[PDB]
Design a protein around this nucleic acid. Structure first.
Ligand SMILES: [Zn+2]
Length: 223
RNA sequence: AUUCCGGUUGAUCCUGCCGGAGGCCACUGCUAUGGGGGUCCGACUAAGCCAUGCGAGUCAUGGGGCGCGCGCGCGCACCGG
């Protein structure tokens, strides 16, 4: 379809982009757990073509900030945006501009560059299935004054959390969760970053080879 | 649904309080077709005052006796329980 449409008019600037364009890197999971740097959004546009669909591109927050000069007030726009494959890959970005379209575009680019993969499972006392509809164990996240704690829930319990957390977890591929919070949750940037870090910290919990089949743990895409 | 949103600045992050948004009880405005079930209706102020009528009686196989009809049968009150 549009693979030859996105790959033909792109000239790589970095070495990872060249590796991807030649064809030696072929799956999304081969770019993560090395010390690789990602400085091109076309890498992710090639390896995850689904992040380009407009239904996977939630725009979260738009703010208008002012800088004083003796002439007048200089206005700037700040846009916090979210991107994600709905099967375990998420990204969060912030973009500034002298107008709104420039800021939105820069936010989506920086969201594509900040892509992470997460782990999923069941882990609940009340469901005990082995299907990756939630997170497999409770996790913590912090940002500024905001603290977030996520806990696994049973099937059909849909996303008991604020709306920013709702959208981020929906772009993550998670469907059931309980939550607790502390701090200035009315500041959208800090709440969003704390939930992002909570989702990241699923990779920081040590597990034994017997837990992967008890909780149905899946790393990245499922099936 | 183990949930958040608005408000102190030229703009920002915090603390902290006020408000919204849910449910139950009492008074109340506008409006109102029909059935069923139920442990609903002068409790909050004055456990303030009350006109009238009803809310506790029964036994004639405990006793004597009066009346009405043919010793018997019906009825009334009295003593007694
Ligand atoms: Zn489950």
């Amino acid at each position: 379809e549009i693979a030859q449409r996105v790959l033909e008019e792109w000239e790589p600037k970095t070495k990872l982009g060249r590796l991807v364009k030649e064809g030696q890197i072929t799956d999304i999971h081969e770019i993560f757990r090395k010390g690789y740097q990602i400085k091109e959004p076309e890498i992710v546009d090639v390896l995850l073509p689904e992040v380009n669909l407009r239904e996977n591109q939630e725009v979260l927050d738009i703010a208008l900030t002012v800088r004083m000069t003796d002439s007048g007030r200089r206005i700037r726009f700040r846009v916090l945006a979210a991107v994600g494959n709905r099967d375990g890959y998420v990204g969060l970005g912030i973009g500034h501009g002298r107008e709104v379209g420039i800021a939105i575009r820069k936010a989506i680019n920086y969201a594509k560059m900040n892509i992470i993969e997460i782990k999923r499972g069941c882990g609940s006392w009340e469901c005990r299935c082995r299907r990756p509809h939630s997170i497999p164990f409770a996790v913590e996240g912090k940002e500024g004054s905001v603290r977030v704690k996520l806990m696994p829930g049973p099937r059909g319990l849909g996303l008991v959390i604020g709306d920013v957390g709702k959208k981020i977890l929906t772009l993550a591929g998670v469907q059931d969760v309980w939550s607790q919070t502390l701090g200035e949750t009315r500041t959208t940037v800090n709440f969003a970053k704390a939930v992002f870090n909570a989702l990241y910290n699923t990779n920081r919990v040590a597990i034994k080879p017997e837990d992967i089949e008890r909780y149905g743990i899946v790393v990245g895409r499922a099936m």
